[PDB]
Amino acid sequence: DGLRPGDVVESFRRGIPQTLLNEMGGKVDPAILSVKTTQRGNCLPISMIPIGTIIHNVGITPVGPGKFCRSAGTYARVLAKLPEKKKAIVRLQSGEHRYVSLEAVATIGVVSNIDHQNRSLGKAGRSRWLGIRPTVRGVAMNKCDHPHGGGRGKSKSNKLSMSPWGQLAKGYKTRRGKNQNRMKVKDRPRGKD
Amino acid sequence: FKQSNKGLYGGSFVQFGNNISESKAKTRKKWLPNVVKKGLWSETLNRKISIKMTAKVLKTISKEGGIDNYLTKEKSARIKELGPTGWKLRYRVLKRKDEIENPPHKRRRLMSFLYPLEKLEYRSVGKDLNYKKFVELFADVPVKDILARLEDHKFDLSTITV
Amino acid sequence: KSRGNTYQPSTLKRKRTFGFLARAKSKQGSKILKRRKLKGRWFLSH
RNA sequence: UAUAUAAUGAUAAUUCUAAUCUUAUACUUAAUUCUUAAGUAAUAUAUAAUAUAUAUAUAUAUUAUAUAUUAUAAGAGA
RNA sequence: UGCUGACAUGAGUAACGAAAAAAAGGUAUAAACCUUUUCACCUAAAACAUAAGGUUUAACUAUAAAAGUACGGCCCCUAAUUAAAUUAGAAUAUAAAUAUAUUUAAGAUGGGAUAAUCUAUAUUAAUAUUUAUCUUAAAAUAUAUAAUUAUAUUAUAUAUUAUAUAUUUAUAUAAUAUAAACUAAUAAAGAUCAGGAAAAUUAAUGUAUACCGUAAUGUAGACCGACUCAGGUAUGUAAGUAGAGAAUAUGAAGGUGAAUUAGAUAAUUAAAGGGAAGGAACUCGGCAAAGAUAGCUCAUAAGUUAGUCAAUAAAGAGUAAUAAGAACAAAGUUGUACAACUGUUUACUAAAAACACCGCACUUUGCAGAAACGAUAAGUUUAAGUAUAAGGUGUGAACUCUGCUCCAUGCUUAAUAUAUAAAUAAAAUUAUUUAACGAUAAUUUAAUUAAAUUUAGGUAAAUAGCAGCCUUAUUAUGAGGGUUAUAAUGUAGCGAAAUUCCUUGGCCU
RNA sequence: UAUAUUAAUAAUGUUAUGAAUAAUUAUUAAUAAUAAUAAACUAAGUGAACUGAAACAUCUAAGUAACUUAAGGAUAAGAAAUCAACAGAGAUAUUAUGAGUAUUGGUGAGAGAAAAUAAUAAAGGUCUAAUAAGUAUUAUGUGAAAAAAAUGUAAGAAAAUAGGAUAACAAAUUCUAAGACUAAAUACUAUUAAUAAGUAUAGUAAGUACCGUAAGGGAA
Ligand SMILES: [Mg+2]
Ligand SMILES: [Mg+2]
Ligand SMILES: [Mg+2]
Ligand SMILES: [Mg+2]
Ligand SMILES: [Mg+2]
Ligand SMILES: [Mg+2]
Ligand SMILES: [Mg+2]
Ligand SMILES: [Mg+2]
Ligand SMILES: [Mg+2]
Ligand SMILES: [Mg+2]
Ligand SMILES: [Mg+2]
Ligand SMILES: [Mg+2]
Ligand SMILES: [Mg+2]
Ligand SMILES: [Mg+2]
Ligand SMILES: [Mg+2]
Ligand SMILES: [Mg+2]
Ligand SMILES: [Mg+2]
Ligand SMILES: [Mg+2]
Ligand SMILES: [Mg+2]
Ligand SMILES: [Mg+2]
Ligand SMILES: [Mg+2]
Ligand SMILES: [Mg+2]
Ligand SMILES: [Mg+2]
Ligand SMILES: [Mg+2]
Ligand SMILES: [Mg+2]
Ligand SMILES: [Mg+2]
Ligand SMILES: [Mg+2]
Ligand SMILES: [Mg+2]
Ligand SMILES: [Mg+2]
Ligand SMILES: [Mg+2]
Ligand SMILES: [Mg+2]
Ligand SMILES: [Mg+2]
Ligand SMILES: [Mg+2]
Ligand SMILES: [Mg+2]
Ligand SMILES: [Mg+2]
Ligand SMILES: [Mg+2]
Ligand SMILES: [Mg+2]
Ligand SMILES: [Mg+2]
Ligand SMILES: [Mg+2]
Ligand SMILES: [Mg+2]
Ligand SMILES: [Mg+2]
Ligand SMILES: [Mg+2]
Ligand SMILES: [Mg+2]
Ligand SMILES: [Mg+2]
Ligand SMILES: [Mg+2]
Ligand SMILES: [Mg+2]
Ligand SMILES: [Mg+2]
Ligand SMILES: [Mg+2]
Ligand SMILES: [Mg+2]
Ligand SMILES: [Mg+2]
Ligand SMILES: [Mg+2]
Ligand SMILES: [Mg+2]
Ligand SMILES: [Mg+2]
Ligand SMILES: [Mg+2]
Ligand SMILES: [Mg+2]
Ligand SMILES: [Mg+2]
């Protein structure tokens, strides 16, 4: 968010540099590392990011890229650290608490363009430019097409809201059963908000 | 069932049959063997052969005491069970066992010695000779001659060294 | 508008899709050529 | 009173792994893009000895057996 | 309504397919062919030059001429995409066929050096979408007497005069000369919708210049339409006059005037012009037709979402017009219903109130993911994206607002509540056989053993639902009230509605 | 660059001051090549639907049509872990009787054998295997309409002092699975000869003209 042409950033994914280690001025002994870490823009592992920090570009593995909280105005918070399990608990923009590798990547600060959600396309041509073709509602279709189709006049056919291929579209958990998220402390609000 | 050419399936293929309902309605269905990917240690090759087999074939390995034994059994049943791949693995195993069993001595340096002489003679008469055609000509000539130089050794391809 | 003019000639497409190679370079086209030969047709493909 | 210390099972949870699974990157003789069999110059492992403090453990010359001239790194895991 | 073949009737009937033609001559042969003249028609084409296509149809067999600098192809390079090709026994998957991922090869609608002062491609020596061209600058002129503006010019395209040559090749240049359009090369710069891939220099030698296209047709008699078919068909130039213009009028050159002609012009039909008196009295309906008092410069209201939206406002003014005296552009207000709007739709009877939309809500998916595809898998799109992303669903901009209910169908969360199906390490037990043991076919039990199922919630911008009955203010009528059923009993708003049968409902204009 | 190249008799025009030449050598030895690849018959994988049952789903059609793959002049089968019934036979493959009998079925439409006796046929009996183990058998899901050997998943023997065969048991018979070869009688095609109460609309053209973009259709 606060990044402007002129600023200076750095990454500590490889680690603290010899430039400071040998100089002893900014080395860990006086613990200037805290104030060198919790500044927006730079990149650090969760291990050396303090608790409660607002971060973005979170990884899953110690050797993997930043995957979560990568869109405009998105951020996550570091909730817990578990050194014995080499894990950390992070809450994502979905409101979900999740386990992540303690030595995973993360950048300090919110992702820019916070107001991207207040934008308003004024015409269908703008969607067409962006690459979005028209969407045809199921009710407007025929019964051979979307199940909602058919019926004289406007009618929903007493058919539970569902996709064209017969999958319920209101509240039906799609990821269900044994194949769920192994790394998941708490689920997202899911209507609480 | 070309899936089986790549593995040791023990001569078991897919089975296409019917699915019967309580109303005795039929619907075509298919039975697959229980293929499992496994790496079995081979002593003669001194390495792990990694292949897809059926659990039955793996159990047969456990009985017979090794992938080498399984591949090198003699019965026609086994010859049929061992598919195209198994056949090649069997060839490798038996070749390796043979070369371990009987080493060559239980000629290439003399070919090298004779190479320059023939090369020079061909050069003198106006022709040429390269290493490939040289070995092709003198591949199968047991008896050598002493037309030039002197044989100051008695190796004679028998009991090399003291 | 008016109909009837569905065939719009273009030698490039004619040869690419109905040419001899377009059929001899595949399983199905090879079968078409073989069937026409067996029937004894004079002209196998464009 | 007026059914588990033990022997076993069921359920829940955590741990380990060569079960399983997913991502990433020089010569000598012998049968001149090759192989094999014995030894090597340097890149790497276990236990015995150098010499340190507490009354279970550091760091190295050199040697003992199996190898490179599939593998590592990360993740899930009975 | 048999099949094929031949021949009839309709019948010498309808038609001969947008069209200007006339003489003289070729020819005492001609409406139809050729020539000359006259007349017309197309002329931002019916002309010229081309692409694609095609029974060479052409000005033809004696026939369409290329080393390249305006010659295309061929060739180098790649896009989209394609490929019995490609990958320690082993690239992955798959009833076969085959399908994935990677390589390689192919593949334009694209890019590719030099060149009129004319030019040289080969071998051996190193490895830049799209759009625009200032309020303001300087001289001299029209400028006024400090204006300031009015302009070549605030940037390019070349030919002449002079100051000089190496026996006048390249320069340093000071002067002279543009009115309006357009072109290819600069320089600077505007929005967001953020704008292709691919093949590297000097030296020394070297070049005898391969192959193929080239006619004519190409808003068409030369292609696609069964036809010498009023249909379909890609580019550039497209005289001048006039205009804002590629509108409209003319038409200089060019091309053309047609497999139907000559008379006659009844009823009647089509296309077109005029019309007394009246002006929608026609009709289901002003359907059709008629109606324009500048086209430039001014001026232009109520509403309004503040957008000259309404607006190209209406009415009106200025400019020669005063009896009129080209074509073309321009065809008035107002209420209501539906839909925010531009757009899309039933190729060939429906263009709309239907679809879409921007906007608004709900919901799923933490990425080793939801969604779709895959005789099914690998795998692919999603996406080289990450909850402000992607999929699904309903509604359909915005103002004012969106009330009550989980009964039912589902979704969703827990209940140490609860059937069972398959799967086994044992035997409290009958039947059969057997001299016999023994061999064959069961019911109960285990520390054992799901999802469902029913219990309790939550969920309606999920699918859905939103009632009846009776007197009191000595009256029609019913603020209060009394009663049965329910999950609850239709709130705000609107109302004879595109929803009202009765119904031309009652009243007003 | 199969007129493509180390070696040779001499060189034009030149070789950073007796050899090595972009047009090349009478020459001689060595080194990369050429997919015309039918049909029918046979075996195997997957396999419909119309239809019949006077409807329809079990059943039928039917393991047929079609697609896919792979051989040979043929392929396939083949010398009993077979039949049979106390007496016996003795390998395959077709045909007649047995016989529309046994058997079987929403006991419906319907389907349906083997012993045994004859015919065709060839010399028709042979050894190649250290005699056969995740095999026989068992449970379970499928599996030629009667009759059955293969087949997914998982447990799993014995040695001729043994094993297979029948719902089961006993007795008796019969044969030896997990190793193999095999002419002939047969199928298709192509020639030759013979006979046609066959064809001139089954009598030679042409898969042409022509129709469709194509697969494909198809004349006189
Ligand atoms: Mg997109
Ligand atoms: Mg939308
Ligand atoms: Mg929509
Ligand atoms: Mg509809
Ligand atoms: Mg449906
Ligand atoms: Mg509808
Ligand atoms: Mg047609
Ligand atoms: Mg195509
Ligand atoms: Mg008549
Ligand atoms: Mg008449
Ligand atoms: Mg007439
Ligand atoms: Mg005349
Ligand atoms: Mg015009
Ligand atoms: Mg003009
Ligand atoms: Mg022309
Ligand atoms: Mg050229
Ligand atoms: Mg290429
Ligand atoms: Mg091109
Ligand atoms: Mg041309
Ligand atoms: Mg021309
Ligand atoms: Mg037509
Ligand atoms: Mg025409
Ligand atoms: Mg004009
Ligand atoms: Mg003219
Ligand atoms: Mg013309
Ligand atoms: Mg005409
Ligand atoms: Mg007339
Ligand atoms: Mg009148
Ligand atoms: Mg009048
Ligand atoms: Mg009227
Ligand atoms: Mg009337
Ligand atoms: Mg009108
Ligand atoms: Mg007013
Ligand atoms: Mg106003
Ligand atoms: Mg008009
Ligand atoms: Mg609309
Ligand atoms: Mg519209
Ligand atoms: Mg229509
Ligand atoms: Mg419209
Ligand atoms: Mg999915
Ligand atoms: Mg969304
Ligand atoms: Mg709607
Ligand atoms: Mg709205
Ligand atoms: Mg509501
Ligand atoms: Mg049970
Ligand atoms: Mg078959
Ligand atoms: Mg029937
Ligand atoms: Mg019926
Ligand atoms: Mg045979
Ligand atoms: Mg049958
Ligand atoms: Mg045997
Ligand atoms: Mg035996
Ligand atoms: Mg069984
Ligand atoms: Mg059957
Ligand atoms: Mg036997
Ligand atoms: Mg045609």
From Swiss-Prot, chain A:
Protein name from the UniProt record: Large ribosomal subunit protein uL2m
Region described as Disordered: 140-193
Record flagged with keyword Ribosomal protein: yes
Organism of origin: Saccharomyces cerevisiae (strain ATCC 204508 / S288c) (Baker's yeast)
Compositional bias per record (Basic and acidic residues), positions renumbered to this chain: 184-193
Full protein: residues contained: 198 to 390 of 393
GO CC annotation: mitochondrial inner membrane; mitochondrial large ribosomal subunit; mitochondrion
Family: Belongs to the universal ribosomal protein uL2 family.
Source organism, top-level taxon: Eukaryota
Biological process terms in GO annotation: mitochondrial translation
Function per UniProt: Component of the mitochondrial ribosome (mitoribosome), a dedicated translation machinery responsible for the synthesis of mitochondrial genome-encoded proteins, including at least some of the essential transmembrane subunits of the mitochondrial respiratory chain. The mitoribosomes are attached to the mitochondrial inner membrane and translation products are cotranslationally integrated into the membrane.
UniProt KW keywords: Mitochondrion, Ribonucleoprotein, Ribosomal protein, Transit peptide
Extra facts: Present with 1600 molecules/cell in log phase SD medium.
Signal peptide bounds: none
Swiss-Prot record, chain B:
Transmembrane segment boundaries: none
Domain of life of the source: Eukaryota
UniProt GO molecular function: structural constituent of ribosome
BP terms from Gene Ontology: mitochondrial translation
Keywords assigned: Mitochondrion, Ribonucleoprotein, Ribosomal protein, Transit peptide
Subcellular location: Mitochondrion
GO cellular component entries: mitochondrial inner membrane; mitochondrial large ribosomal subunit; mitochondrion
Protein purpose: Component of the mitochondrial ribosome (mitoribosome), a dedicated translation machinery responsible for the synthesis of mitochondrial genome-encoded proteins, including at least some of the essential transmembrane subunits of the mitochondrial respiratory chain. The mitoribosomes are attached to the mitochondrial inner membrane and translation products are cotranslationally integrated into the membrane.
Subunit composition and interactions: Component of the mitochondrial large ribosomal subunit (mt-LSU). Mature yeast 74S mitochondrial ribosomes consist of a small (37S) and a large (54S) subunit. The 37S small subunit contains a 15S ribosomal RNA (15S mt-rRNA) and 34 different proteins. The 54S large subunit contains a 21S rRNA (21S mt-rRNA) and 46 different proteins.
General remark: Present with 4000 molecules/cell in log phase SD medium.
Protein name per its UniProtKB record: Large ribosomal subunit protein bL28m
Species of origin: Saccharomyces cerevisiae (strain ATCC 204508 / S288c)
Lineage: Eukaryota, Fungi, Dikarya, Ascomycota, Saccharomycotina
The gene coding this protein: MRPL24
Whole-protein coverage range: 66 to 258 of 258
Curated annotation (Swiss-Prot), chain C:
Cellular component, GO annotation: cytoplasm; mitochondrial inner membrane; mitochondrial large ribosomal subunit; mitochondrion; nucleus
Keywords linked to the UniProt accession: Mitochondrion, Ribonucleoprotein, Ribosomal protein, Transit peptide
Subcellular location: Mitochondrion
Main location: mitochondrion
Single GO MF descriptor: structural constituent of ribosome
The keyword Ribosomal protein is annotated on this UniProt entry: yes
Example of a GO biological process term: mitochondrial translation
Highest taxon in the source lineage: Eukaryota
UniProt KW Repeat keyword: no
Signal peptide per UniProt: none
Family designation: Belongs to the bacterial ribosomal protein bL34 family.
Other known facts: Present with 200 molecules/cell in log phase SD medium.
Assembly information from the UniProt record: Component of the mitochondrial large ribosomal subunit (mt-LSU). Mature yeast 74S mitochondrial ribosomes consist of a small (37S) and a large (54S) subunit. The 37S small subunit contains a 15S ribosomal RNA (15S mt-rRNA) and 34 different proteins. The 54S large subunit contains a 21S rRNA (21S mt-rRNA) and 46 different proteins.
Function field: Component of the mitochondrial ribosome (mitoribosome), a dedicated translation machinery responsible for the synthesis of mitochondrial genome-encoded proteins, including at least some of the essential transmembrane subunits of the mitochondrial respiratory chain. The mitoribosomes are attached to the mitochondrial inner membrane and translation products are cotranslationally integrated into the membrane.
Protein name: Large ribosomal subunit protein bL34m
Organism phylogeny: Eukaryota, Fungi, Dikarya, Ascomycota, Saccharomycotina
